[PDB]
């Protein structure tokens, strides 16, 4: 029938498709289904790391203020990640979701000042706009182009009320003064599962351009673009909820027949 | 393997319902020994087929499947043709014809369109049935909407035939998708399932189809209201709680 290598591919796929705040439940389901603990360890190792980086998992490093996000941008290889604010690498346990062994690390310094200016501006932006949001800002050269990558995460987990949600946004500013090219994606996932399984999956792509000057005045323009676009997206989502509700949804089924009463089943059967 | 089935059904409650069909196919590849149990207990979006004899659409699901063929409630034949597929008894088939006509009127009154199908099967001391309704908005609207109703009723008959016990397990799947400038891609989809049971008198003034009709109508009205609350209320409040 199905090869072991295919089975564990599927197992790994499911693990990576766990909704926010429900990683352990999916993992335990997949474990019992595969019923081959030594196969699962081999073929789905990557899955835990992939999930954590995809979901912008926030982690606390003891001794440092706020939290850092686990993302593809911070992956240093061999289970270590960059915290570009505190200029350290740390070891990340993808099962326990725990950071350890902080060590000094610097990566590139063309963008040290720009990254710090952007980080400072974005931190205030995130704390003001999200109830418990976190951000991480990276500066790196990509194809000879200096790039600031800003990542934002915010989640709310209420599994005892059968729901969880997460917002992620990732903003890239490719800096070629006096212009910066802007590319972003905003993503939302909400899961409600009391007697059912209902999910919102949403994303929006953003492209923009901004004229740049000094690091601080530029960081300010970047946060203004972020704020306008994220506010716009949130506004539009709520407007779309309204349109869906009183157009499409109402069109799918009436609340009652035109009679404004329930059916007379005796007239039906005649 | 009750444990395995419980894990598989838990996974279906958690994996994104936008991939509900691939989720089921992948699960069956992961645990092939569960195939029959999964095809029975994992609801899927309803598909439409044409009954060529009558020029009428009918709905496909595991409950009208035998081998790789499906039975029409209009012609009572399998397509593709089958030797000796599962069939309702003669008397149950008459009830099934009557139920199909009643539910087509119900569908018209509530959905003003779409497609319905009813499939019954014999049990040892009664019968069971599924009432299926599919309604899709125009797919040319880039603002897609689809509704699937799956109502499974078990009827345990008593020696007299003057009372029966009815157990109803109902799923509604509701799928909405939009791709717009302001809100980007939004896909809001999935399903809710609820269950209820009741004893009812069975008589010429209250026959089985009336008793089942009322239970289905009460449940579907309740589920419509809950969908409204969860889709357009709860999930929206959660989004706004994130930012």
């Amino acid at each position: 029938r199905v090869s072991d290598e295919e089975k564990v591919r599927i197992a790994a796929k499911f693990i990576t498709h766990a909704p926010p705040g429900e990683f352990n439940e999916v993992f335990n389901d997949v474990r019992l289904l595969l019923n081959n603990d030594n196969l699962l360890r081999e073929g789905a190792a990557h899955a835990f790391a992939q999930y954590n980086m995809d979901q912008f998992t926030p982690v606390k490093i003891e001794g440092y203020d706020d939290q850092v996000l686990i993302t593809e941008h911070g992956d240093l290889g061999n289970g270590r990640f960059l915290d570009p604010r505190n200029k350290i690498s740390f070891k990340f346990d993808h099962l326990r979701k725990e950071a350890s062994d902080p060590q000094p690390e610097d990566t590139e310094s063309a963008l040290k000042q720009w990254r710090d200016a952007c980080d400072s501006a974005l931190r205030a932006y995130v704390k003001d706009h999200y109830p418990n949001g976190f951000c991480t800002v990276y500066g790196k050269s990509i194809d000879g182009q200096q790039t600031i990558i800003a990542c934002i995460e915010s989640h709310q987990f209420q599994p005892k009320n059968f729901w969880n949600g997460r917002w992620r946004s990732e903003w890239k500013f490719t800096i070629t003064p006096p212009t910066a090219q802007v590319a972003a994606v905003l993503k939302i996932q909400v899961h409600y599962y009391e007697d059912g399984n209902v999910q919102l999956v949403s994303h929006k792509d953003i492209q923009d351009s901004v004229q740049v000057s000094s690091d601080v005045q530029t960081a300010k323009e970047f946060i203004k673009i972020i704020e306008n676009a994220e506010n716009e997206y949130q506004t539009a989502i709520s407007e779309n909820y309204q349109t869906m509700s009183d157009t499409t949804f109402k069109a799918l089924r009436r609340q009652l027949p035109v009679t404004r009463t329930k059916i007379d089943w005796n007239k039906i059967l005649s | 393997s009750d444990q395995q089935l419980d894990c598989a059904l838990d996974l279906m409650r958690r994996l994104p319902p936008q991939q509900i069909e691939k989720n089921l196919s992948d699960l069956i590849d992961l645990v092939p020994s569960l195939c029959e149990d999964l095809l029975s207990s994992v609801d899927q979006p309803l598909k439409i087929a044409r009954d060529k004899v009558v020029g009428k659409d009918y709905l496909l699901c595991d409950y009208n499947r035998d081998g790789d063929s499906y039975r029409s409630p209009w012609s009572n034949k399998y397509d593709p043709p089958l030797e000796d597929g599962a069939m309702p008894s003669a008397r149950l088939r008459k009830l099934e014809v009557e139920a199909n006509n009643a539910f087509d009127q119900y569908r018209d009154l509530y959905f003003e369109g779409g497609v319905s199908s009813v499939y019954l099967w014999d049990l040892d001391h009664g019968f069971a049935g599924v009432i299926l309704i599919k309604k899709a908005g125009d797919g040319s609207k880039k603002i897609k909407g689809c509704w699937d109703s799956i109502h499974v009723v078990e009827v345990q008959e008593k020696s007299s035939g003057r009372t029966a016990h009815y157990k109803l397990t109902s799923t509604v799947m509701l799928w909405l998708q939009t791709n717009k400038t302001g809100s980007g891609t939004m896909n809001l989809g999935g399903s809710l399932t609820r269950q209820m049971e009741k004893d009812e008198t069975v008589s010429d003034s209250s026959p089985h189809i009336a008793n089942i009709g009322r239970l289905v109508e009460d449940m579907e009205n309740k589920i419509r209201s809950t969908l409204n609350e969860i889709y357009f209320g709860k999930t929206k409040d959660i989004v706004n709680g994130l930012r």
């Binding site: - | 838990d10 790789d68 599962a86 499974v152 269950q195």
Partner: peptide, 19 residues
């Protein structure tokens, strides 16, 4: 933790499993 209502729906016996 979650209740699975569809587990208790009456089984319909088929002549042939899928091929």
């Amino acid at each position: 933790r979650l209740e699975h209502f569809t587990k208790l729906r009456p089984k319909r016996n088929k002549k042939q499993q899928p091929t």
